[PDB]
Amino acid sequence: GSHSMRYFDTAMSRPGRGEPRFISVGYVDDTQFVRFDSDAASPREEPRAPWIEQEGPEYWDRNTQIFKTNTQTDRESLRILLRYYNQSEAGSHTLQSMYGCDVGPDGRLLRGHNQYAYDGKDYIALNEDLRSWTAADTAAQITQRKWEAARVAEQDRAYLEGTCVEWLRRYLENGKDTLERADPPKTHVTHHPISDHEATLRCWALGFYPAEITLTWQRDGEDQTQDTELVETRPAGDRTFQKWAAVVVPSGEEQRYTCHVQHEGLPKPLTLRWEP
């Protein structure tokens, strides 16, 4: 199917508590495969991603050096941000970035990503065109002018169309047994009375990979989106995810409700009901 590679980078200042801690976590779809931490000498590999262990020294040397370069840049960008927002040196601030590529079944680029936030808010993002920037405010417009002048978009696009695509393709090949396997949800419907005239129908989906899934309830073949309580998809701890969708139904009308499940692991969408 389709795949993604993403790095999630966080730099958090902590005045009076040493230099800002910098962390870069790498993922293939919903599988974490690497972690770089400024609080750690060497990177950590994921046991659930053993396919990364076959990389050898040249890969680890260059990645360690890129990370060190990134730690200095982000620590510097954090100092400049206080000036951009007229902020004191007393407070703790967070600079985040997330970047990477999306590829189709043929491993060709579907889309590239490179966005940054400061203190939880959008700061600057590389647009889908991989040429223009969206600056969120006047401080990010200064970054935007400095990056247009230095032709930074061209350098990032190069990574996104080049290195990012070629390395994801290699990671997917090396980890084909897991990265290429979709685990379908195991599903069931539970029932709990709320009162003498209403009951909750909860449609469960467990043990699925990737995390992406659609759980919907229909009443008489009509989507119940507005009235469905939907929990956030959550990790099980063994690479898989879990999610439920619940509806409050008039007691005695349970059979008019059908849960609809869509997931990459399923050849076609499932339909299931409460089976008393």
């Binding site: 870069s24 990645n63 890129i66 840049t73 982000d74 600079l95 970054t143 230095a150 990032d156």
Partner: peptide
């Protein structure tokens, strides 16, 4: 594989 930051903010 990591991208190196081309420039700071």
């Amino acid at each position: 594989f990591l991208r190196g930051r081309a420039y700071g903010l």
